[PDB]
Design an enzyme around this catalytic site. Sequence first.
Site, PDB file in Angstrom:
ATOM      1  CG  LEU A   1      -1.786  -1.248   1.392  1.00 43.18           C
ATOM      2  CD1 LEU A   1      -2.754  -1.077   2.552  1.00 43.18           C
ATOM      3  CD2 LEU A   1      -2.529  -1.557   0.102  1.00 43.18           C
ATOM      4  CG  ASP A   2      -0.274   4.558  -2.648  1.00 48.96           C
ATOM      5  OD1 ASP A   2      -1.183   3.705  -2.703  1.00 48.96           O
ATOM      6  OD2 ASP A   2      -0.448   5.759  -2.940  1.00 48.96           O
TER       7      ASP A   2
END
Lengths: 128, 240, 178, 85
Positions: D39-40
């Site tokens: 995830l960013d």
Amino acid sequence: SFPKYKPSRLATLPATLDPAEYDISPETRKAQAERLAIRSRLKREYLLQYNDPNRLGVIEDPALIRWTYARSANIYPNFRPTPKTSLLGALFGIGPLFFWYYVFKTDRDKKEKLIQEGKLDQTFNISY
Amino acid sequence: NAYSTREHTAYYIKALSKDLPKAVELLADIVQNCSLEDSQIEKERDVILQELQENDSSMRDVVFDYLHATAFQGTPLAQSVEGPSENVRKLSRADLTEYVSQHYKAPRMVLAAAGGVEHRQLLDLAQKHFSSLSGTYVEDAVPAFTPCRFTGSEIRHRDDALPLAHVAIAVEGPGWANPDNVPLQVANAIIGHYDSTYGGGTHMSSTLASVAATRKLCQSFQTFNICYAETGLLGAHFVC
Amino acid sequence: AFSAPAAYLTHQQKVLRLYKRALRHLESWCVHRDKYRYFACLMRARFDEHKNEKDMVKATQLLRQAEEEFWYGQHPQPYIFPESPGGTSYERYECYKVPEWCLDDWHPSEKAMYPDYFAKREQWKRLRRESWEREVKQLQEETPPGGPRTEALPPARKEGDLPPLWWHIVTRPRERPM
Amino acid sequence: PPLTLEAIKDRVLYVLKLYDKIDPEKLSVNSHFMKDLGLDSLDQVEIIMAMEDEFGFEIPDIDAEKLMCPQEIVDYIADKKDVYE
């Protein structure tokens, strides 16, 4: 190009819409760090006294003392009769009194004139 | 050679095509690894002050600087490229380093070549030498472009001792990208340019040029279309 | 529980805050979940489009324009969580919250009604009274010569030492005191 | 509504498992979204928003950015809701 937000005195400009928040320089960041330094020192002193198990009583805030003094005592010592001060004082002190004198005197004189001319109704006005 | 303008700064090397790699190396070293040594700083301060004294003689540059000052008063564009003498004497190595860091960035730089240059070779050399330069701003301090207001104004430095009078008059013009620049350039070409050395004289098509030649009104007159990103100076300069 | 603030907000943090504000106001405008999901995916795509812009000037201008768009498109009555600032229930139970020092002034008869609790309270008082000196010493040692340049406070370095300035955070009135 | 610690952990893992980008099998209490998962930042923002919607309490942005872990979310929710078991 949505319509822009005209800031006013009772509608401050949102920081998001602040033209300066997007033009930052090295000096500005340095100043922000210094302001955080001041805040952190003040918070450290406060929390140290606030969490002291021996302290019993108020933690006298010098800022509050300064605010109260400036709002009460310091006014006259740092007042100088000036054109603005003198004219505003005249207007807002004596102006309203003469306006209310004009109003009440005119009304009362009219009432007295009507009473003298027998042209006023006080049929049941028996409690003054 | 290098040239600095209010909106652009350039360093270019004229060289043989076979010497392109060394030219790229030197340009990279100049742009990135500039010493900015203090002693050279003092010597260049002396030189810059002397040249500010020299430029005062050049009437045309002085008049155009006045035009920028009055037209773009209160805006960064009013400032001269050389800058005030007080700033020149007060400048320090820290300020020059900060200027290089803030304004010399990879996204704001273009490496350009003309002549016997292969684009693949130039790209490979740039990757070899110019790759290190970065566009990140220290502590997220990003300069912001500011639109500049144009103020109708008149600045008159009356020095009757001076032999001839220099006048520059301009109106606000298009930016670089405005499509109107071409028709305005055509109109200015219609207005034309004249100097006393011009051979055409009276028969020149430009009515102003013909009249100036016939009446000897002006030693020189030229029309300029100076364009900046969001504003420009459109007008003429005549010495008479 | 709030973390100490930083002097400035990084560009990434500002973008994240704008993203959160835009999503919440969109949810306010898009009452139904499906429409919200569709337009929220649209907004995520919008951010991804310039996610990787190299030029910081261009990204800053984009953020500025996005904030202007947000101000034009903000919901006049954005949804506020009931207990959040501006919420219907914000500070509703503040009056019920009572400071711990009040118990010390209880009459002995009142303290008799809850003996074990006050014994435990005496134990906690002893812990604080012992820990204060070491906490002050640690704060002095870690503090830089100029002074504390951030509100962050160090954790307990050694066993048997409580975190400096721990009393009020630990003994803060319960969220729903009743 | 006692809202015990185990309930908070179970509900946070519920929300995360219903998150398509996270693969359910490798999801763990200590699976940092930034490092262990892929995830960013915007995914961090979305997950924090999902948690605050699930529990109905808003996590301030300054605290929200620093979670970076499910167990961190669980403990922060416990601190806010005064869950001691």
